[PDB]
Each structure stands twice: as structure tokens, then as C-alpha cells.
Amino acid sequence: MKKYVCTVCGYEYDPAEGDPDNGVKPGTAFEDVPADWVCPICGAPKSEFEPA
Numbered sequence: 001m002k003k004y005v006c007t008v009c010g011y012e013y014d015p016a017e018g019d020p021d022n023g024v025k026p027g028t029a030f031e032d033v034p035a036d037w038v039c040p041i042c043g044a045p046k047s048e049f050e051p052a
């Protein structure tokens, strides 16, 4: 799918690996990531990401 970048710190969300530690299964499109999911490294909200 499409990777998304955290505009605050550069952390990249990769659909291919999801975020298992938070129940985000691999294959999860960023659009489908939980609304309250935040960037693992800076805490920024989903609204602060940008399609890469």
C-alpha cells in the first residue's frame, strides 16, 4: 500500500508491517488505522501524517 510519514519527526508508517504492538495488523491501510493511534516516536496524531 502507501507509506505515511509523520510530519513532526519523520517516522514512517508502513502498511506492510502495521503496528502489531497496538493490534494494527500487517496490511492495514493508514486510512484504516485506529482513529486514536499516535506516532510511536513523538506522539503526534494521525492528522499530522502525510502520504509518502
Ligand SMILES: [Fe+3]
Residues within 6 Å of the ligand: 006, 007, 008, 009, 010, 011, 039, 040, 041, 042, 043, 044
Ligand atoms: Fe512522529
